[PDB]
Design a protein around this nucleic acid. Structure first.
Ligand SMILES: [Mn+2]
Ligand SMILES: [Mn+2]
Length: 755
DNA sequence: CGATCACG
DNA sequence: GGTACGTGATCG
């Protein structure tokens, strides 16, 4: 038995066949299972009811659907024995066809485990864990460059370069003559796409790495392949890449391989105002990368001048995509293994969903019936539910960052905080949460505390094996493993409060907050007696300084302080020194900005680096943050805003800095609310423009009476002689909102930021 | 106001 | 194979 990399199912003669994709001593192996059956559970009012319930019918694919077999089973629900009926079906697609017919029934109290994908059901029930062993996978980074012109329909412009990279080097396929050693020149867009197919089939990578390939590279390749009448047999079974709807965006799978899209991974792992490949590469490897903008690529392609510069950019995009994939995949591979689900799914999940998958597997192992996800009504009510400090103003120097998160798993375990132990009837001994008063039964270990204890013990064993290991290879692997456990264990606190959670528990989250606070108040008091000033406190951590002290002294005392507190705090309760900042300011909870000793600005919940904000607002905000953090000058920042707003009043700002960009996401007739970008889009369609979802609309808001939608103009129609932009809109709805939250940390109101 | 829409 | 989340802007 090798290493499981993915699992799915195919249908044959109307029957499902599970496919397990493996890597076994360097070779691709596919195992087939025809015997695993889909099922749901039904809790009935009485055993007699099963005779009526087993006879429930549905329709799918022209043919009727039936319950294949029924089985009475004894399980645990809410920490209590329960008798339910396992209802077997022939095909997994039968479940969404019959589940509501079963739930409808007057004798059915409730149904359970009815929205678990068949391939994930299989992995859990068969006790199969992906990414186990030392099996070495192969990787290939792939990227593309397209010919783009302002506001074009997705896929109108051809693909002009395809790049790929591995340990053999970074290469470019193009259909215009470029003399570089790494450039392969082919005859057409069609032949370039066929060459990428040939490179993928010959290299046969286990992992295809992209940077946002879910939304750009693969959807674009598929669109161009369609127009060109060619197939993309990239799957190991010769199937084409498959587009999956994840939210409003996309997810692309390549069967028998792992399509590893770094974009969701990096977005979760590191904190940046923009997730451009250049910014990401610099943040991870501390090296600068050149950007070649779309308009420059179009000019070079159309003119045929400066093409060597475009091919170098395409080559580097693949090269750095390969380096980033190799950097980030080991941790995704260990998280996959820990939660027992494929890297494809895990690399695209929130920590809340990682917890749920860990809990679902553990629920099967422990014969525990899993709770259902909430309905729309329950999900909204949880978002409404109310739970039982304000930052220091001004600009602070020499800020130390302390992390509290490794406190909470220990609190959950010691106080047996779990939905199954909350306010239990006929309980002999209980823990009472401070202030909130929630009672947690001590008579049996709760489902979650029990799992968390095993997680923490497993991490301590790995850490002990690391000290006693003389092998640098296993030390590396074990380091990723104990880190993966820390990430999962530290996600439970937040999960209890996650409105979409199965094991959601508001009282659990408040109780943990109430018990946690006693340690937060201890840290705060011990810091304050040491001369430290606490500037910001969240359940996650704090920021402190020693007013008027030398930076080395603040660091030394802080490092001494964590060493001291950890020696006083019992068990696995741990304080962590996160870092040091030269300067910083705090607005409210998770709204702050800091600058490190290397000059990098780190912010949370403030920056507006997005295409639906004008350049003038983004430019002014970056300038305000630089004046404050790099220059230590809030008076400079206030003067910057006053100058910009006056310049907008006097029509001194170039119209290119006033453009707003917003995507059309549906046919124009499907809109309920006609926002400015849609009003502009309708006028374009009226003119004969082929408006399609995906098209990004550039507009400028003009002066006039009424709502902005009636006053917005397409950028290509804006004439500086004829049209006059709305200075009030750019001052009040763009520039001032971008800077008013930042400046409020220094005592300014919106009204103080003009002449 | 509540509903609708889009960013990354 | 169910088809994201948190958050702010703008519409109706
Ligand atoms: Mn899959
Ligand atoms: Mn690119």
């Amino acid at each position: 038995a090798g290493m499981i990399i993915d699992a799915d199912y195919i249908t044959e003669d109307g029957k499902p066949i599970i496919r397990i994709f493996k890597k076994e001593k360097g070779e691709f192996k596919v195992e087939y299972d025809r015997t695993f059956r889909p099922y749901i559970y039904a809790l009935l009012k009485d055993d007699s009811a099963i005779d009526e319930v087993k006879k429930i019918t549905a329709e799918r694919h022209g043919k009727i659907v039936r319950i294949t077999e029924v089985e009475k089973v004894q399980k645990k629900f809410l920490g209590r024995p329960i008798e339910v009926w396992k209802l077997y079906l022939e095909h997994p697609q039968d479940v969404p066809a019959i589940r509501e017919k079963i739930r409808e029934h007057p004798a059915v109290v409730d149904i359970f485990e009815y929205d678990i994908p068949f391939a994930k059901r299989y992995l859990i029930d068969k006790g199969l864990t992906p990414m186990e062993g030392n099996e070495e996978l192969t990787f290939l980074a792939v990227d593309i460059e397209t010919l783009y012109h302002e506001g074009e329909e997705f896929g109108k412009g051809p693909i002009i370069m395809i790049s790929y990279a591995d340990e053999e080097g970074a290469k470019v396929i193009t259909w215009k003559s470029i003399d570089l050693p790494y450039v392969e020149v082919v005859s057409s867009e069609r032949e370039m796409i066929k060459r990428l197919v040939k490179v993928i089939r010959e290299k046969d990578p286990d992992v295809i790495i992209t940077y946002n390939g879910d939304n750009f590279a693969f959807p674009y390749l598929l669109k161009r392949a369609e127009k060109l009448g060619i197939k993309l047999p990239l799957g190991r079974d010769n199937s084409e890449p498959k587009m999956q709807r994840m939210g409003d965006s996309l997810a692309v799978e390549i069967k028998g391989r792992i399509h590893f899209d770094l974009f969701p991974v990096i977005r979760r792992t590191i904190n940046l105002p923009t997730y451009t490949l250049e910014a990401v590469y610099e943040a991870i490897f501390g090296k600068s990368k050149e950007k070649v903008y779309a308009h420059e690529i179009a000019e070079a392609w159309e003119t045929g001048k400066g093409l060597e510069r475009v091919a170098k950019y395409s080559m580097e995009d693949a090269k750095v995509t390969f380096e980033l994939g190799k950097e980030f995949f080991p941790m995704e591979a260990q998280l996959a293994r820990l939660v027992g689900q494929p890297v494809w799914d895990v690399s695209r999940s929130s920590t809340g969903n990682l917890v749920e998958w860990f809990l679902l597997r553990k629920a099967y192992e422990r014969n525990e019936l899993a709770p259902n996800k909430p309905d729309e009504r329950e999900y909204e009510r949880r978002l409404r539910e109310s739970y039982e400090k304000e930052p220091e103003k001004g600009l602070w120097e020499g800020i130390v960052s302390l992390d509290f998160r490794s406190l909470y798993p220990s609190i959950i375990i010691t106080h047996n905080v779990s939905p199954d132990t909350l306010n239990r009837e006929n309980c002999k001994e209980y823990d009472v949460a401070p202030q909130v008063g929630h009672r947690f039964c001590k008579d049996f270990p709760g489902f979650i505390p029990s799992l968390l204890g095993n997680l923490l013990e497993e991490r301590q064993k790995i850490k002990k094996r690391m000290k006693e290991s003389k092998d640098p290879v296993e030390k590396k692997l074990l380091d990723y493993r104990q880190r993966a456990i820390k990430i999962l264990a530290n996600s439970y606190y937040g999960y209890y409060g996650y409105a979409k959670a199965r094991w959601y528990c508001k009282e659990c989250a408040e109780s943990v907050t109430a018990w946690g606070r006693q340690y937060i108040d201890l840290v705060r008091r011990e810091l304050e007696s040491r001369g430290f000033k606490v500037l910001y406190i969240d359940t996650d951590g704090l920021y402190a300084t020693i007013p008027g002290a030398k930076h080395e002294e603040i660091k030394e005392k802080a490092l001494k302080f964590v060493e001291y507190i950890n020696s006083k705090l019992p068990g696995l309760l741990e304080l962590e020194y996160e870092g040091f900042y030269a300067r910083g300011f705090f607005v409210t909870k998770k709204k702050y900005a800091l600058i490190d000793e290397e000059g990098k600005i780190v912010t949370r919940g403030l920056e507006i680096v997005r295409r639906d904000w004008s350049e003038i607002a983004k430019e002014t905000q970056a300038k305000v943050l630089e004046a404050i953090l790099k220059h230590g000058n809030v008076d400079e920042a206030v003067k910057i805003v006053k100058e910009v707003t006056e310049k907008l009043s006097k029509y001194e700002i170039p119209p290119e800095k006033l453009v707003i960009y917003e995507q059309i996401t549906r046919p124009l007739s499907e809109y309920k609310a006609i926002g400015p970008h849609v009003a502009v889009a309708k006028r374009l369609a009226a003119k004969g423009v082929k408006v399609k979802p995906g098209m990004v609309i550039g507009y400028i808001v003009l002066r006039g009476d009424g709502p902005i939608s009636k006053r917005a103009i397409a950028i290509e129609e804006f004439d500086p002689k004829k049209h006059k932009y709305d200075a009030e809109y750019y001052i009040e709805n763009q520039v001032l909102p971008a800077v008013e939250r930042i400046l409020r940390a220094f005592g300014y109101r919106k009204e103080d930021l003009k002449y």
